[PDB]
Paper text:
Here, we report the biochemical and structural characterization of the β-galactosidase enzyme from H. lacusprofundi (hla_bga), which belongs to glycoside hydrolase family 42 and exhibits psychrophilic and halophilic properties. β-galactosidases (E.C. 3.2.1.23) catalyze the hydrolysis of lactose into glucose and galactose, as well as the transgalactosylation of prebiotic galacto-oligosaccharides. Halorubrum lacusprofundi, a completely sequenced extremely halophilic archaeon isolated from Deep Lake Antarctica is an attractive system for detailed structural and functional analysis of protein adaptation in extreme conditions and of special interest for astrobiology. We demonstrate that hla_bga combines features enabling halophily with a fine-tuned protein flexibility to enhance catalysis at low temperatures. Based on hydrophobic cluster analysis, amino acid sequence similarities, the conservation of catalytic residues and reaction mechanisms, hla_bga is classified as a member of the glycoside hydrolase (GH) family 42.
To understand the molecular features that enable hla_bga to adapt to high salinity/low temperature polyextremophilic conditions, we determined the crystal structure of hla_bga at a resolution of 2.5 Å, using the molecular replacement method. Hla_bga forms a homo-trimer where each monomer contains three domains: domain A, an (β/α)8 TIM barrel fold domain (residues 1–390); domain B, an α/β fold structure with five helices and eleven β-strands (391–614); and domain C, an anti-parallel β-sandwich structure comprising four β-strands and one helix (615–700). As a trimer, hla_bga resembles a bowl with a central opening that has a width of about 25 Å at the rim, ~40 Å in the center and 7 Å at the bottom. The three monomers of hla_bga are tightly bound to each other by extensive hydrogen bonding. Each chain of hla_bga has 18 hydrogen bonds and four salt bridges that contribute to the inter-chain interactions The solvent-accessible surface area buried in the trimer structure of hla_bga is 10,083 Å2, which constitutes 43.1% of the trimer surface area. Finally, hla_bga contains two unusual surface loop regions, one in domain B (residues 532–543) and the other in domain C (656–674). Electron density for these loops was missing, inferring that they were highly flexible. These two loop regions contained an increased number of acidic amino acids (42% in the loop region compared to 18.6% overall protein structure), illustrating the convolution of halophilic and psychrophilic features. Firstly, hla_bga is highly acidic, having a 5–7% excess of acidic residues over basic residues compared to psychro-, meso- and thermophilic homologs. In hla_bga it is caused by the lower number of lysines and a higher number of aspartic and glutamic acids compared to its homologs. It is particularly pronounced at the hla_bga surface, displaying 33.6% acidic residues.
Numbering used by the authors:
A (entry chain A), B (entry chain A), C (entry chain A): 1 to 531, 544 to 656, 673 to 696
The structure:
Amino acid sequence: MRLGVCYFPEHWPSEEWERDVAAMADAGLEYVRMAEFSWGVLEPERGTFDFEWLDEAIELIGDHGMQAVLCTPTATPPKWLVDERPSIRQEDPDGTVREHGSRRHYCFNSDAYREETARIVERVTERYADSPHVAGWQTDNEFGCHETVRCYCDDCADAFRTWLADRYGDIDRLNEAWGNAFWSQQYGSFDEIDPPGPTPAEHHPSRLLAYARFSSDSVVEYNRLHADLIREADPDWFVTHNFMGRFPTLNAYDVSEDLDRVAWDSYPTGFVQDRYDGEASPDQLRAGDPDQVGMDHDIYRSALDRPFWVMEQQPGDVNWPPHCPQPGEGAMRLWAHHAAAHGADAVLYFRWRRCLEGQEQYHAGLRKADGSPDRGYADAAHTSEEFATLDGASHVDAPVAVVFDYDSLWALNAQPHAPDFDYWALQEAFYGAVRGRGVQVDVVPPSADLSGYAAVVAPALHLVTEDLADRLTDYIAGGGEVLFGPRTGVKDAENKLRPMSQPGPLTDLVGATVDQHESLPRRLETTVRRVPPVSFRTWAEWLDPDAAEPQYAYDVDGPADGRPAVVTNTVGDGQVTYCGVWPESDLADALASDLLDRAGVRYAERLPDGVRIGYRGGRTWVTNFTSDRLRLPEIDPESLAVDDSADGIVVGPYGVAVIEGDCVDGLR
Amino acid sequence: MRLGVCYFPEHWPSEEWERDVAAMADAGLEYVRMAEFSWGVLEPERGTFDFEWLDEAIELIGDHGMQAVLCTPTATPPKWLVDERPSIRQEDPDGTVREHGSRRHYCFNSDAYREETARIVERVTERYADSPHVAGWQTDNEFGCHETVRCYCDDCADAFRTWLADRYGDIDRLNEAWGNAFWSQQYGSFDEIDPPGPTPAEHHPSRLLAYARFSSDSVVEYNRLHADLIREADPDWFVTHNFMGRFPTLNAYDVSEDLDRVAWDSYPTGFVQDRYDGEASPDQLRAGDPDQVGMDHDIYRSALDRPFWVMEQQPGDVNWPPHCPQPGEGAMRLWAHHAAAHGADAVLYFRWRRCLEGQEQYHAGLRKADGSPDRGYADAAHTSEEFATLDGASHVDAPVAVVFDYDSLWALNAQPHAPDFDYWALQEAFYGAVRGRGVQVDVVPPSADLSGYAAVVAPALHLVTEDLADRLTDYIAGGGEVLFGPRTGVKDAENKLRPMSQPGPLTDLVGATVDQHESLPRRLETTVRRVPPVSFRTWAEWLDPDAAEPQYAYDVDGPADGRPAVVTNTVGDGQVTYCGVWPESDLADALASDLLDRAGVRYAERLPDGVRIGYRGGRTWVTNFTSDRLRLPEIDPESLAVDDSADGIVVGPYGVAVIEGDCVDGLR
Amino acid sequence: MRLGVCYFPEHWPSEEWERDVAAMADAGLEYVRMAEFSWGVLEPERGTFDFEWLDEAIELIGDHGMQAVLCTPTATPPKWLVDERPSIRQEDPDGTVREHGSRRHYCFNSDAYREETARIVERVTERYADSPHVAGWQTDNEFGCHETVRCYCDDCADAFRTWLADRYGDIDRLNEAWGNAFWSQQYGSFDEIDPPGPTPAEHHPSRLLAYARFSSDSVVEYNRLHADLIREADPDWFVTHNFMGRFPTLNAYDVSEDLDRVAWDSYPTGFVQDRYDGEASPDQLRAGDPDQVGMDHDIYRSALDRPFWVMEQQPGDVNWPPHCPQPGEGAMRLWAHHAAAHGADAVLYFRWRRCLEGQEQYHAGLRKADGSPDRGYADAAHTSEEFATLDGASHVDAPVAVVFDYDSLWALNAQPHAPDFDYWALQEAFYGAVRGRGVQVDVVPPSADLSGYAAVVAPALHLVTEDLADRLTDYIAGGGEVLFGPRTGVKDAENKLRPMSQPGPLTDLVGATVDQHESLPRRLETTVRRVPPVSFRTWAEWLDPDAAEPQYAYDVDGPADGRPAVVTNTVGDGQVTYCGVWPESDLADALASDLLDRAGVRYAERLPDGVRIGYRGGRTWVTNFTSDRLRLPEIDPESLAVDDSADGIVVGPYGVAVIEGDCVDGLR
Ligand SMILES: [Mg+2]
Ligand SMILES: [Mg+2]
Ligand SMILES: [Mg+2]
Ligand SMILES: [Zn+2]
Ligand SMILES: [Zn+2]
Ligand SMILES: [Zn+2]
């Protein structure tokens, strides 16, 4: 709908200021976000303040018809503050303090930093509460980036001890809940508990999961401090945060419980590089992967059951990934329309102009170093016009749900049982099989209500609380069916095994138990056939069908030969399928298409690997991350978003096509 | 002969206790080992003790006819003790203290820990000295695991200084023995010597070897403290320890000098993964490598010249190696019979039931999580019956010897001169060539007497003491012949070069000197022909035949072309062959078969790669780690151990076959 | 011209002393360098001194007709000094002190060490000022080796603060020159600046470049202390230093500004191993790469515009590289003649005899361990005779120049924008293309005067000072043409971007601007054709020809398809070509041959990959690093240096051929 850009008047002289806001008006960007790293300029020394620049900045943003979203400067305390109160910095487990010289050099549990966040944010919000045309506020900047969610300092130790006391009540319930008899790891009292440090072997899984939950909850409380004082300033303002893609350390659900709108930063070409399982391909090197960006879009939309923003959007070549080839022609228009299809009503590009200045010189902006426009500006203008023309897009609703569980993520990160195992890649297999049929997908936590969904897929439900278990049993008994992936129903809320066999509380919600599991180097032939041969990847679980009906068996020809691999069971009205195998493309597509068959939804035929389509409101969007070409027959030119006989429409490389009418179709 | 299991009543409720000991009686396991990690349960706080559970435990083990072997709880001091006396923990070279949160968090040289080992072990042995049916005692648990042999704390510094003074007498003998003039590294006094810490370049080889010897001797004295007080408790008891496979940091010979029986922990599928040189193959992924497990069996048997135990045996899937595929059908029966062939009279499986509890949840037991039996239980029962039926097996004696020298191992670990060089792999090449002919092999230190051996193979004798040198000269003059590998006769007892050329004290016990040596990336063609072409690996030493007779020359076609590679010489009665080359399979087999020719022993024809046979007492065992099948004609069905015309016997995948009669044969 | 050896009488008994100096006379080595690591022997305790050995040593070196070059023992302070004043040692960023146990364990900024360098060097030079036959002095030993240029201790912190104050005057000029507004990184005062330590993300580029310049300048001042007191001792003496190959941390130009002769250590087989981009080939494993050793030869010759020495030369197999295969037959004669061709008048081999002693036992010498000669001795004798026969070789002058900029090196090391990017490899591509035509090349800093050069090549001029810019414009306007590589004209003296587009101050000295740049994984097809198809590597810069004339365009067929890749422009008299691409062998050779066409120099036809020729004085040298054979027709046998009809001369594997007459030729 609306577009924007992340501006930094801090770096540029004030002569360029109004001409640049004028260009930002020319492009059609109705939002401008600044003041992230402006603490050092505002307070050069303690007691001295320099607000006026931002005032004029806001003025010009309001002079040209855009509303500016401001942010707390907490991400970068200046050097005088760090030298003044060194206790604010964090420590990694062996105790080395993460110094100044970059961003994110503070600890979420140091009461000192709480005091001075209070001071600085109080003074910056009271300057702007009622009068000016600021739109809302965003918390610090990318909470927990550079692995700053978990600190092992002594302030975190005290916070950990009281968090533990609050969770468990007394020491004996902790010892029996984690079960500390193995390797005589019982705690005599809560003080005897230290944040995990260097030790000869692995750390206790319940201990590590407790510390992960503790770190994420610490940052949730810090964010609530932020949001409390922001709401204190002006009741109309929204509070929001910019999260990151494929980020494991911060539970965005609970922190989003404290805000009004959700935002995140997407850089497709960079994240397709970061050992996205397998070698990043050229078209991926220039456009990214539609499914990684898409799952992040869905996870941040379904946070509040409301549309989201993308607070930072890749403008061109960036600096952090190993290589950064030039993205394809119109890749930014492509990403904007991708986010718009996935639910974003605002897309703000980072940044306005390439910074000549810091350790991000190799990060482009919508403008060059000259003040000349970069490719980002042109594509931003084009997507602006098309966003205007296509309607006041509604909030998508997904018929299918995938349950994303940060606790399962952390617990398996602690115990992968394979070097090539990754929760992100598993959820990606299942979710991308569902999206390869063309549906809109919702990814949610166990907290959400599973009613109102045709089908649900739970690739990893590692820890199953029994309330969650009977909720799913009643959903499958009364409503649609479910597809569970491998490694679900293994541990409890305390990351502990059950006296029963896998999948514990779900064992009767499926037709089988699990004899045992094995982890496989991806060097062995790993196939399944149906009881045609498809291959699976990295993981196998032998199914003991006690209730009923194996579907796929192992043609692996090892010691698991001929044993059930996939299973189905019809408990009452509605079904349940269990996949004890990490499926490759074909098997996952078969499972997805069949579950979609069972739930009367309108899956399109197998869309190509770099082609994704989504129905928002009434219109439907086809985003082409492939650089070849696409041709959809069966649809004549009545499309709203088109580029500059009736044989369909042709969607060029990195192009979008918005069409109305919720299709069941194929293409190229 | 007898079977067992490592039980932990600590984890399980006492209602399952007698039913589980009843099942352990059903399987036929006459030994039960517990109390390893029970310090935290016994002494929850200082002065408070909780013995009674173990009492009843022992009672039930004695109620059902099995003798229980107990162990000191020293491996895991509880948190209250660590917080009480933090000085007990270790430090790695840069000085970071290895905290609590795992096992093995103590230092062998901290007098504090000596005091409290005295306290706890005194109190636990006096509880059981004369009266109950405990069988013997095992020291802590896997001494030095997780790299805990070498600590760099200050207590170790004092222990190192006095160990050095005891070895060298005065500072000047140390300086001249290590020769500290290079890089002006001379010590003015013994206090000027610090345990090795961070330094810009490598560390002195004599210094590092001194510290390795010092760490291992420190743990030998700790073990002698243990054994002294155990023998103090009951004169009948045996003292033993559980060592590890392919473990370089602890000299098991000298610590075994302090005990009565030797035991070790075998997990074949896991250790075949740990960069066992080359990619672990599928049949290896499910059965392991017969030669690695076999050399460990031999090294721990020949420790006391007595049979050994395998205190921990893989029950199924385990947790530590990167991947853990399900082992083959009957792999545990296979490992039990493998150890029985190699000399083990007791084989105790770890553990009884998969622990639901600690950081080893992914480690199976003989029973499932349900209390249901796992594959391990069934295979344990089957091997129990066959162990009963085949006789009261004798102690094997080997005709051939391989000299394993921990000092050579440490010295070459400090100076590999190649990234792909490994003492384990070299000894494996030679030993496996000998075993591929079907013999029983003894692996011993230079301390042992070399008489009573048809032939001897010394792959790496890096440090040759002159007493050892004339012992070998008299052995070769009066008795059998020897085969020396590369890098023998290079340094003295002080890890220092000789003024002479290689191999120093042995130069006249062989026909040649060594012109020079080269290290080779395994990318170049590395062949030898005899003076048909076989390939060698990673190492070459040009031989200068001064006395006599090159056998193999270099067809490598480099600057070493045509120079002697292998050599033979007949000093008196009996011969000596020197292999200045790391031989691949074919060359090593030729050398092994020929040395066996020279010593009138009964080598069988080349057995397949995953097939190993051994003659214990009167019976001989063929263990098949291959999953194909095996067929031995020339032997009709009179076999003792067989699975459930006369064309031989067929040994299926992962099967054993015990036959009587010391064969010279081939197979499949 | 003259040969030598690096002797250590410290290790050997004095009985071998005169026989070894006699052998050194036999070989013809007129220089002997000792006293590097002799501090521990000289001063065993403080106040006690033991000079006499060296006296006799010098005597014998003078008794047999050779002049001995001595060195300060500063590289290895003994243990008593380190224990006495521990503050002398260095610290790496997280603060761990680099202990004793190796060499180079001192800090260049600790005033303590300045005091005791003064003490020890004063006492060692006054012992020898006027009377004896020592030739000159060499500073410590390989300054900064094992990464000891940059220390992060507190003494370095104070030195850094005052160096910064001296460079910038006040804090505000530093903040605006580095531009510290990004991530609020401004400094309130110079004390607020700490040497870079652990921080969650990257460090500021200007900050890191400042610290690199600071470390190198610190060692320049330490070297000036050394040289000042050496010149104080005897006015006739020369001061020199031994630098290293491919060494990035020490600016040899500025330290050479303080000495009279330049020396360096060449080990070709070892450095061709150290991830010299690509797999080191067999002939490289035995001879090295002529271009890496050659560029180091040129960089150390052009330091003072005078000939150089090679203070350490590989004698045979060495210890530091991963593998060390035996070098080819006569490889040392080959290296000696290679250095002689490149300008070395003295070549001193390290070392005399393999040290039996320290952590370098696996490093050969010219003699074996026996005191027997090694291959090095024979080849040293042969190259001695030929050096005598061929004339009193002059100082080479190069017609072409390559600008090597340590600041560009450090700045791109901080921001490679690619994992496979390396300043050494880029300069190697261009320089080796020039040498593959057979010319002599000079590699110099921007400090040197560019007049007197037919053509100049600047592969990376990352930071262009405007004085440098107008110097190059006037050179191209009045004289020859230039070839600029990628990533030149990007930042200023402060490592900051310009408000203009690339290449900033050079934008009108070339026909184009730079649209943008991309980094490429070497997995994509990366070609160019001329406006036949050659391939490029790892880097591309789209050229916007505003002034004139693209030569090569992109046949890569991506989003950069058809855009100019190489460009040429004729500003006045003389031309300029810009290569926005990292060229592979063929493209680089085309560019080199064409620039040589433009400058009327006598390039020979494409010489093979392991063949290098150079014209020193009147004679010209062809060094064959290839092991095949070479045949030069068109030249009959009148050659001066030849090995033991008229169809040319044949140069065998690893042979030299010195011929007179400055050729334009081809070969094999
Ligand atoms: Mg700690
Ligand atoms: Mg230390
Ligand atoms: Mg610091
Ligand atoms: Zn912290
Ligand atoms: Zn210690
Ligand atoms: Zn320092």
